[PDB]
Design an enzyme around this catalytic site. Structure first.
Site, PDB file in Angstrom:
ATOM      1  N   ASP A 131      86.015 -13.214  38.568  1.00  0.00           N
ATOM      2  CA  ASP A 131      85.235 -13.840  37.522  1.00  0.00           C
ATOM      3  C   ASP A 131      86.108 -14.142  36.296  1.00  0.00           C
ATOM      4  O   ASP A 131      85.717 -13.901  35.154  1.00  0.00           O
ATOM      5  CB  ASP A 131      84.029 -12.968  37.146  1.00  0.00           C
ATOM      6  N   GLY A 191      74.347 -10.137  30.187  1.00  0.00           N
ATOM      7  CA  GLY A 191      74.681 -10.572  31.524  1.00  0.00           C
ATOM      8  C   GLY A 191      73.364 -10.584  32.267  1.00  0.00           C
ATOM      9  O   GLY A 191      72.431  -9.878  31.877  1.00  0.00           O
TER      10      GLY A 191
HETATM   11  N1  LIG Z   1      85.062  -3.952  25.133  1.00  0.00           N
HETATM   12  C1  LIG Z   1      84.329  -4.973  24.548  1.00  0.00           C
HETATM   13  N2  LIG Z   1      84.480  -5.198  23.204  1.00  0.00           N
HETATM   14  C2  LIG Z   1      83.814  -6.164  22.547  1.00  0.00           C
HETATM   15  N3  LIG Z   1      82.959  -6.990  23.130  1.00  0.00           N
HETATM   16  C3  LIG Z   1      82.768  -6.809  24.508  1.00  0.00           C
HETATM   17  C4  LIG Z   1      83.444  -5.777  25.309  1.00  0.00           C
HETATM   18  N4  LIG Z   1      83.016  -5.883  26.614  1.00  0.00           N
HETATM   19  C5  LIG Z   1      82.126  -6.906  26.688  1.00  0.00           C
HETATM   20  N5  LIG Z   1      81.984  -7.468  25.444  1.00  0.00           N
HETATM   21  C6  LIG Z   1      81.220  -8.693  25.174  1.00  0.00           C
HETATM   22  O1  LIG Z   1      79.970  -8.773  25.849  1.00  0.00           O
HETATM   23  C7  LIG Z   1      79.993  -9.918  26.724  1.00  0.00           C
HETATM   24  C8  LIG Z   1      79.310  -9.571  28.046  1.00  0.00           C
HETATM   25  O2  LIG Z   1      80.005  -8.446  28.648  1.00  0.00           O
HETATM   26  P1  LIG Z   1      80.181  -8.331  30.157  1.00  0.00           P
HETATM   27  O3  LIG Z   1      81.049  -7.167  30.516  1.00  0.00           O
HETATM   28  O4  LIG Z   1      81.061  -9.416  30.704  1.00  0.00           O
HETATM   29  O5  LIG Z   1      78.682  -8.254  30.806  1.00  0.00           O
HETATM   30  P2  LIG Z   1      78.455  -8.955  32.211  1.00  0.00           P
HETATM   31  O6  LIG Z   1      76.981  -8.628  32.452  1.00  0.00           O
HETATM   32  O7  LIG Z   1      79.387  -8.441  33.335  1.00  0.00           O
HETATM   33  N6  LIG Z   1      78.744 -10.500  31.982  1.00  0.00           N
HETATM   34  P3  LIG Z   1      78.852 -11.781  32.890  1.00  0.00           P
HETATM   35  O8  LIG Z   1      78.676 -11.431  34.434  1.00  0.00           O
HETATM   36  O9  LIG Z   1      80.238 -12.424  32.583  1.00  0.00           O
HETATM   37  O10 LIG Z   1      77.667 -12.764  32.591  1.00  0.00           O
HETATM   38  C9  LIG Z   1      81.491 -10.272  26.870  1.00  0.00           C
HETATM   39  O11 LIG Z   1      81.773 -11.630  27.265  1.00  0.00           O
HETATM   40  C10 LIG Z   1      82.007  -9.966  25.477  1.00  0.00           C
HETATM   41  O12 LIG Z   1      81.687 -11.053  24.577  1.00  0.00           O
HETATM   42 MG   LIG Z   2      80.324  -9.795  34.720  1.00  0.00          MG
HETATM   43 MG   LIG Z   3      81.376 -11.357  31.383  1.00  0.00          MG
END
Ligand SMILES: Nc1ncnc2c1ncn2[C@@H]1O[C@H](COP(=O)(O)OP(=O)(O)NP(=O)(O)O)[C@@H](O)[C@H]1O
Ligand SMILES: [Mg+2]
Ligand SMILES: [Mg+2]
Ligand SMILES: Nc1ncnc2c1ncn2[C@@H]1O[C@H](COP(=O)(O)OP(=O)(O)NP(=O)(O)O)[C@@H](O)[C@H]1O
Ligand SMILES: [Mg+2]
Ligand SMILES: [Mg+2]
Lengths: 338, 343
Positions: free
Chosen positions: B142, B31
């Protein structure tokens, strides 16, 4: 092949329509609300692009009204316009072979960067086009690589696509949902409605940075992601900066020098830093950008294109174009130029 | 191999620190301001995901505070959280193998579309997760395919990524720059600041439409392009509709018959659901609970419904009082007769 004959009105000059014939039509582009074709004029053989958009006959087409006022060597020329059919407005433009987008993509997926001489030529011509439209109060609002046409052999760049353009007037509010993702000024991301033409300068800065990096500098699927990427480079906005334009990380700016690859010209980096500024009024004007030291090589009596040709027109400034700061003509028009 | 031992605070319940040891750490996600690792717990050999984000020593983490309050079978579970190091907050979550995004991308590039039975299961579970968080006033902000975790074999879906989530309080303004491009409600594109949880419903609608089409329904690099695509389908917003979204020089286009928007033989009920989700007027959109009760999901309520691979479907009717709070009576439709059999 099918020959089409229409009665079209010259882009400039007096409203005196003439018969124009063309052939060899082929789609060469699109857009959410548009279709572009390439065609050859029957008498001259010249190639043209024809942008066709649904027009509400009851109203004036803003893109058309703006283009009819423009006459600059770095802005794609509107040759004629005509209606066809639901009614469509057709803008017949000079045909330009490439885009900064396609060219940049070539170097990117070849694992190389565009030679700096071209970065200088392209950015300088973009800033000239911006100085010109801004002098009329016109903000493009969609500055991005796909809207920058290029002729590979002459190195001439032409700004195109005025479908988002608008004359900005103090006190009037403007929509904040214009401008492509990666190239949007922070104030646009924050939903400002009283933004100025400096949003085009931020975009120009994103293009420069991208040409230097080989990829977009502020990518992101949401506004929040873009803000984070901006903050990871510029550092967290001071409250005053935010006001000029808050659940955000307190991050220190990243050394502009460490943002780019080693070997990246210092002047290029310096130009970037003066373009990509949080405070809209602190960014360089396009005319000031043209005068930046990063472009000194273009003013060298001996510069030549890599293909051996002379550089395209670079110094034919008009009073209209220099109006935001006449004294700069001393820098902009080298001793050897005319 | 390297073993990491940490002392972690439980997601919910008493604050009694647990010692956790894991190995086989590898990046599985990113992210703009985060990283997610997969890890194997030394004891049980269970895999878990660890979301690592930089934490303001100067604030409390909202994503963390929100996740600690959630307990739903369609929301990825926060097992523990701990700090490490600049200080980082680490959220240890149940590991889920897939995303609706990856699954959809596989079918799409294979020129196929997933069996509608899966579209029903995934969308239904997404709406359950939304009815649950919304009942607390929490808006995800989101909703998109990448934030919808999937277990391929059980067909269980788990909403994840609460990094944009927030409790919407009436009278309070909220930023309009949240939510991924293709899934943003029109009011968000128009810069509304007084939007409600119904923006999650619009997003859910974009996911459904995309699962049916094989590609995003409202693509576009600028807000203007997105508005044009929205308009090409819904037709130009009426004067009043523009006032509902709030905060306009777009060509007047008539609505495209929804039926003509999807491939031939797309289920009518699916199309009807879409039309009630993707509405200009925020208040006119179905609530997530009402969506769960839509006829498009009737098949999930059939007693003999099974996953194609022969297994039983995931739990679908264990609705709590909290989940139903927005409209208790809907339970007469949501909990089918066979699910009320005591036996
Ligand atoms: N519990 C989980 N189990 C397996 N894979 C996971 C899990 N949580 C996150 N991921 C993976 O990691 C990716 C990124 O996680 P995320 O929680 O959405 O980070 P983020 O920084 O908030 N992302 P974003 O703001 O959507 O760009 C997700 O889209 C999944 O592919
Ligand atoms: Mg996110
Ligand atoms: Mg995400
Ligand atoms: N004069 C031209 N010569 C050659 N190609 C052109 C010309 N004008 C447009 N094109 C091409 O067609 C594409 C789309 O044209 P454009 O004027 O930008 O349509 P648009 O609908 O306003 N686009 P956009 O809003 O940026 O998605 C451009 O990016 C060029 O690649
Ligand atoms: Mg364009
Ligand atoms: Mg355009």
């Amino acid at each position: 092949s099918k020959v089409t004959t229409v009665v079209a009105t010259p882009g400039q000059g007096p409203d005196r329509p003439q018969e124009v014939s063309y052939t060899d039509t082929k789609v060469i582009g699109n857009g959410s609300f548009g279709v572009v074709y390439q065609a050859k004029l029957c008498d001259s053989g010249e190639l043209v692009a024809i942008k066709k958009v649904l027009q509400d006959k009851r109203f004036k087409n803003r893109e058309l009204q703006i283009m009819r006022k423009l006459d600059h060597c770095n802005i794609v020329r509107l040759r004629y316009f005509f209606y066809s059919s639901e009614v469509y407005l057709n803008l017949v433009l000079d045909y330009v072979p490439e885009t900064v987008y396609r060219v940049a993509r070539h170097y990117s997926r070849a694992k190389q960067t565009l030679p700096v001489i071209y970065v200088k030529l392209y950015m300088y011509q973009l800033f000239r086009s911006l100085a010109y439209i801004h002098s009329f109060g016109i903000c493009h609002r969609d500055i991005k690589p796909q809207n920058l046409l290029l002729d590979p052999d002459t190195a001439v760049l032409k700004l195109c696509d005025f479908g988002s353009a608008k004359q900005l007037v103090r006190g009037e509010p403007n929509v904040s949902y214009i401008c492509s993702r990666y190239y949007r000024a922070p104030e646009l991301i924050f939903g400002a409605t009283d933004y100025t033409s400096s949003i085009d300068v931020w975009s120009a800065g994103c293009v420069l940075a991208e040409l230097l990096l080989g990829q977009p500098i502020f990518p992101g699927d949401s506004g929040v992601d873009q803000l984070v990427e901006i903050i990871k480079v510029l550092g967290t906005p001071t409250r005053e900066q935010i006001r000029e334009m808050f659940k955000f990380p307190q991050i220190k700016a990243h050394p502009w020098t460490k943002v780019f690859r080693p070997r990246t010209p210092p002047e290029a980096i310096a130009l970037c830093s003066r373009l990509l500024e949080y405070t809209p009024t602190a960014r360089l004007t396009p005319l000031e950008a043209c005068a930046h030291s990063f472009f000194d090589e273009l003013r060298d009596p001996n510069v030549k294109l890599p293909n051996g040709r002379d550089t395209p027109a670079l110094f034919n400034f008009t009073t209209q174009e220099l109006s935001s700061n006449p004294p700069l003509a001393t820098i902009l028009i080298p001793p050897h130029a005319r």
